[PDB]
């Protein structure tokens, strides 16, 4: 019944105290935490406390949206060669470090996720050729699917891959989508391997990486520029954002300490001191 | 900096195979998509593109004879180059991109190469 924007628990005034209560001395072997409030080692009045811990719910924790990648076009001189004009990246949070650390405070979660795309485009060569407004297609190609070979081949009609066809210079594009995991809960981490080497087997046979697991394959995002080719060359952006909404969290763990490399839990030489100097008895 | 090395380079008569590799000095946390180049005139051409794995792009030349691959874990790829030509004959170049399936002379740093002759 007690709601996150609750008001915390009042200060009972406490007088002084001579007895054989020893609130004070604990014994953290057990691996419990002392539950003391200041009423058990000082002389208390009486405070009705307001402050609530209403920001601090972990879905008020995680309300903010986050970059996540940033993908790229480009136009050459004519054809003259090329015409792989698109953009393909491979979903996955890991590649920034505001949000993947985030999601690291816990071992798994489940929530619905909305993203939000911000594009931006502009021109190279200074030209007094002009382009009209560009039209983007995300498309979201899940696991299994043909991912587009050419700019204009067949994998563009959509018939069954949800897409969003955004016009430039309106309200940045924004979808929701739902807790879409294999599992009963995304796994932020992941202490195995996705296959069992056999020994009647090659090595390179039953191999595959520390920590990988379909758990999060998620597919693919490509996009690109539903427009035809211009004589002047303009290049886009698109910025993800994601925002984990109607979020649940399990299992709490420590927070990253040195800076990621990798997808994995792996850390690079030069990279292992996080603290500063301070001496022992300076405040 | 950050370096990559071009190896395997050689020359072969017409018909022939070969594997070049390029690798990177240390992990790079961030380039996911390597691509191959090459050159013989004064122009650079875009030979072929391989992001993480397993989604391969190649050229309108390259195709069906080349095939690149590399590891999901260590940041290198790998060039299979069968039914060589003596057109293919240039110097091969490796640069690593970010989330850019796409290909275009537009890269940062250059390495060094590694030369491919074909003979007739």
């Known amino acids: 019944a007690a709601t996150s924007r609750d008001a915390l628990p009042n200060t009972e005034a406490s007088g002084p105290t001579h007895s054989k209560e020893i609130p004070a001395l604990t014994a953290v072997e057990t691996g419990a935490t002392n539950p003391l409030v200041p009423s058990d080692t000082v002389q208390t009045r009486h405070v009705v406390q307001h402050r609530s811990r209403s920001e601090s719910s972990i879905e008020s924790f995680f309300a903010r949206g986050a970059c996540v990648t940033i993908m790229t076009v480009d136009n050459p001189a004519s054809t003259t060669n090329k015409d792989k004009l698109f953009a393909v990246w491979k979903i996955t949070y890991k590649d920034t470090v505001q949000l993947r650390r985030k999601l690291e405070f816990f071992t798994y979660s489940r929530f619905d996720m909305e993203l939000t795309f911000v594009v931006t485009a502009n021109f190279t060569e200074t030209n007094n050729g002009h382009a009209l407004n560009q039209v983007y297609q995300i498309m979201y190609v899940p696991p299994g699917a043909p991912v587009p070979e050419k700019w204009d081949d067949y994998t563009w009609q959509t018939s069954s891959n949800p897409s969003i066809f955004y016009t430039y210079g309106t309200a940045p594009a924004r979808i929701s989508v739902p807790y879409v995991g294999i599992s009963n809960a995304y796994s932020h981490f992941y202490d195995g391997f996705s296959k069992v080497p056999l020994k009647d087997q090659s090595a390179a046979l039953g191999d595959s990486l520390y920590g990988a697991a379909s758990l999060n394959d998620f597919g693919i995002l490509a996009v690109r520029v539903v427009n035809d080719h211009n004589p002047t060359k303009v290049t886009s952006k698109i910025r993800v954002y994601l925002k984990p909404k109607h979020i649940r969290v399990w299992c709490p763990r420590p927070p990253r300490a040195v800076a990621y490399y990798g997808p994995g839990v792996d850390y690079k030489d030069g990279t292992l001191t996080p603290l500063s100097t301070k001496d022992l008895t300076t405040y | 900096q950050v370096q990559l090395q071009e190896s395997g380079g050689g020359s072969v008569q017409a018909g022939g195979s070969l594997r070049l590799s390029c690798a990177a000095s240390?992990?790079?946390?961030?380039?996911?998509?390597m691509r191959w180049f090459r050159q013989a005139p004064k122009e650079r051409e875009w030979v072929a593109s391989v992001?993480?794995?397993?989604?391969?792009w190649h050229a309108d030349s390259v195709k069906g004879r080349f095939t690149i691959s590399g590891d999901n874990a260590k940041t290198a790829a790998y060039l299979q180059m069968n039914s060589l030509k003596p057109e293919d004959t240039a110097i091969y170049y490796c640069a690593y991109s970010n989330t850019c399936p796409g290909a275009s002379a537009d890269f940062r740093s250059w390495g060094q190469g590694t030369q491919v002759t074909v003979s007739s």
């Open positions: 992001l993480r794995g397993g989604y391969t």
């Open positions: 240390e992990y790079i946390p961030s380039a996911n998509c």
